[PDB]
UniProtKB/TrEMBL annotation, chain B:
<dbReference type="GO" id="GO:0019303">
    <property type="term" value="P:D-ribose catabolic process"/>
</dbReference>
<comment type="subunit">
    <text>Homodimer.</text>
</comment>
<dbReference type="InterPro" id="IPR011611">
    <property type="entry name" value="PfkB_dom"/>
</dbReference>
<dbReference type="GO" id="GO:0005829">
    <property type="term" value="C:cytosol"/>
</dbReference>
<feature type="binding site">
    <location>
        <position position="279"/>
    </location>
    <ligand>
        <name>K(+)</name>
    </ligand>
</feature>
<feature type="binding site">
    <location>
        <begin position="12"/>
        <end position="14"/>
    </location>
    <ligand>
        <name>substrate</name>
    </ligand>
</feature>
<dbReference type="InterPro" id="IPR002139">
    <property type="entry name" value="Ribo/fructo_kinase"/>
</dbReference>
<keyword id="KW-0119">Carbohydrate metabolism</keyword>
<keyword id="KW-0808">Transferase</keyword>
<dbReference type="Pfam" id="PF00294">
    <property type="entry name" value="PfkB"/>
</dbReference>
<keyword id="KW-0479">Metal-binding</keyword>
<feature type="binding site">
    <location>
        <begin position="40"/>
        <end position="44"/>
    </location>
    <ligand>
        <name>substrate</name>
    </ligand>
</feature>
<comment type="similarity">
    <text>Belongs to the carbohydrate kinase pfkB family.</text>
</comment>
<feature type="binding site">
    <location>
        <position position="240"/>
    </location>
    <ligand>
        <name>K(+)</name>
    </ligand>
</feature>
<feature type="binding site">
    <location>
        <position position="246"/>
    </location>
    <ligand>
        <name>substrate</name>
    </ligand>
</feature>
<feature type="binding site">
    <location>
        <position position="137"/>
    </location>
    <ligand>
        <name>substrate</name>
    </ligand>
</feature>
<feature type="binding site">
    <location>
        <position position="242"/>
    </location>
    <ligand>
        <name>K(+)</name>
    </ligand>
</feature>
Amino acid sequence: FLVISVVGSSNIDIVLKVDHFTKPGETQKAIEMNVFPGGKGANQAVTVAKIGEKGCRFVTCIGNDDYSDLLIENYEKLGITGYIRVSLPTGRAFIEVDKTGQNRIIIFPGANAELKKELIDWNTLSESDILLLQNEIPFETTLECAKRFNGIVIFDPAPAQGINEEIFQYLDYLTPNEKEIEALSKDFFGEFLTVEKAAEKFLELGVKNVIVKLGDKGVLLVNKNEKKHFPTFKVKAVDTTAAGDVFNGAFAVALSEGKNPEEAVIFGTAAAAISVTRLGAQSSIPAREEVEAFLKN
Amino acid sequence: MFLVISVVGSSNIDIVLKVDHFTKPGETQKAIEMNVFPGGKGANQAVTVAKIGEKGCRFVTCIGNDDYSDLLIENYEKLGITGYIRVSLPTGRAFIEVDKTGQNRIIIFPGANAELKKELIDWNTLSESDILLLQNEIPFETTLECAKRFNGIVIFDPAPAQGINEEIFQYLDYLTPNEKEIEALSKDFFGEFLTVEKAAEKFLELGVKNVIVKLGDKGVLLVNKNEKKHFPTFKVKAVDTTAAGDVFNGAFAVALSEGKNPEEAVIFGTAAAAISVTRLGAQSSIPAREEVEAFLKNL
């Protein structure tokens, strides 16, 4: 199988349950506070580990704090290696969630902001064949990795802000969701006509494959040779959080096992679909057996 | 020699998240900065007592077993502050979102503070104290039971003013509301708010021995059976009034401990508060005893 590395962000997700969204000037008691391992990078790494069942190499910067210990415990159980501890607080997502389950989020990069080129063990990274990237660490690091990686480079443009055009030519896969491809098109092409056309324009910048994740509507794969729409599974969704992360990790697992990109898209679609039926981010990541039972079923 | 002071109350980590604009529902926003500060009214007062009294402080408080509790223990240890109790809940924390205008909003997780129940109070040890500082940031039943049982001077800072039962007042030697608090308290317990002086008087009728109303710029009002003395404050360039009341209460108590009369103690606390409002922050604003003395001498 091909070896996967994720280079990206780890967060502790601090979920503050409240009756209503706190108003400016208001002091409100949290009904609950619960912490969970998180981060787009980690979510993808955890997906790879759980679905691939061969652990994951995950280059990520965390702190030296309790939350860091918590993440390491999580990583260690899953066979996830490659974390780097720094003296900053672990990256944090402060997630205020009201009684309806709507949320908002303040993100503190913390340790994630220390994941700079100088800390990448490039020799060890060259041992990998597939590389997963997002946009929650310094963009220059993500860019350098995409530039230097000999292997399949998958870039999740999430969030879409702060991305330089130089990265695209180095990508094998660009995996925006619908909101991201819109922002990205406006940004780089000065307009947003459609998903298909935006995807086409990215192929012009050197991106080999665009996979547009379309939620209910499924996924669009666009490359030189085809524009394949893949419908998704009709599930009862409860929480779409991390669905895209799950898609990317499971997609990468499939490629690692020698599946063609279309097969891999189907496999990750299955995984993502299971995940939206569960509350939470990493807690929603299905086990491989669950993904298989889905596709068999 | 000096009277021994105990604080029974709250310890909080204040987590200040600096943002461009208030985060909207459904929005993910990057914090410009995250800065963490020790807080809680109890701790602010204990730290005041320790730093201005220079004899440490007995401070019964519940904290967690987490990194933040470790940081609070280091702070407490260095200042000679003893009596904290560790529990398995997270240390109390407040998540303060501040936009570019300086307007804020706050989510408060009481955590360990909610575990400070009457069953955890070492009453034998507490009876070794002569002055008791209370606020309203732990379960009221605990605050109330302390004020009931304390043989000594009982000082109650009704902060926040909500959730207070009338029973506590008859056990108080000092009630120290600020202006918003005395208003709320008067409305709640006497059905109206006329004036600050009239409210303070009514509290005297419930058995409170002294009311000290903290009026900010306007100074402080002392009300008891024998007098209604207004104390102007010291004209300083204020920058941050955070914890000014906590500093007042702790410094006030230090003065009593050293045998100063309540009027002297008000002056002393006024001076300490006044220096604090000239400095950014809560516990970071607390002056050292020498600073308070240099202030008073300078008049």
